[PDB]
Amino acid sequence: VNSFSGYLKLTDNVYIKNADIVEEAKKVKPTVVVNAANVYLKHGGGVAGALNKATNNAMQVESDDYIATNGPLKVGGSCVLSGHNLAKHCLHVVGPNVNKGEDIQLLKSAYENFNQHEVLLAPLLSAGIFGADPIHSLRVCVDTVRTNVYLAVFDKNLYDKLVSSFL
Ligand SMILES: Cn1nc(O)c2c1CN(C(=O)c1cc(O)cc(=O)o1)CC2
């Protein structure tokens, strides 16, 4: 039993809710919140911008030190950093950004990072400002992630479309 509430169950291991991931993280304090990161960990907008703002820019400060030491992530890759006031840990995962021309096949590699964590609160990778089709992202999630994932979808209209079209 865990503290996630109000989710619709899609599969054995994938759950979904119309929710603001920032507000959900603040309330649950999950072990892992996933950020929709880019390779530079520049958290300017979308989910990343919102998570970073909720940490009062502490996420960005930590991320800048990470990049200065380690260099950029790979598209499809990830790193574990602090969750600050939102979670124990933040798993920064880089899905492909279609608006930069990155290969959508890398979306599966991105979701594979979730399998290193037993339970996660996450957004749909490559959705929103990353330009991918969220219906496709949900399909890849369900077909790739084997650990327990709680998906937060900010837009109510999109949430309803994702549920109604789910096979
Ligand atoms: C600035 N702020 N603070 C918050 O709690 C939120 C925001 C803004 N926001 C996003 O930028 C966003 C975009 C998106 O595609 C998915 C998502 O989960 O969040 C949603 C929730």
- In whole angstroms, give the CA distance from residue 113 to residue 53: 24
Please tell me if the CB atom of residue 59 comes closer than 6 angstroms to any atom of ligand 1.
no
| Whole-angstrom distance, CA of residue 74 vs CA of residue 95 | 9
Q: Cβ(79)–Cβ(65) under 8 Å?
A: no
Q: How was this structure determined?
A: X-ray
DSSP 43: -
Q: How far is the CA of 62 from the centre of ligand 1 (A)?
A: 20
Q: Is ligand 1 within 6 A of the CB of residue 46?
A: yes
Going from the N-terminus, what domains does the chain have, and what CATH number goes with each? 8-165 (3.40.220.10)
Of 24, 47, 51, 130, the one to substitute when testing ligand 1's pocket (max ligand atoms within 8 A of C-beta) is 47
> For residue 156, what are its two tokens?
């109510």
Q: Say how far apart CA 44 and CA 53 lie, in whole Å.
A: 9
Q: Return all residues near 118 (Cβ < 8 A) that are at least 6 apart.
A: 31, 147, 148
CA distances 15 to 77, 80, 146, 161, Å, are 23, 22, 12, 15
Residues 6+ apart with CB under 8 A from 111: 93, 125, 140, 141, 144, 145
Which tokens hold the place of 37? 């990161």
The tokens of 13 are what? 């291991």
Tokens of 130: 């990353």
Nearest residue by C-alpha to atom 2 in ligand 1? 50
- Using an 8 Å Cβ cutoff, are 123 and 110 in contact? no
Mutate to test the pocket of ligand 1, among 24, 43, 154, 155 (most ligand atoms within 8 A of CB): 154
User: Residue 48: CB within 6 Å of ligand 1?
Assistant: no
User: In terms of Cα–Cα distance, which of 129, 132, 78 is closest to 104?
Assistant: 132
Give the distance between the most distant pair of CA atoms in the chain: 45
Contact 139, 112 (CB under 8 A): no
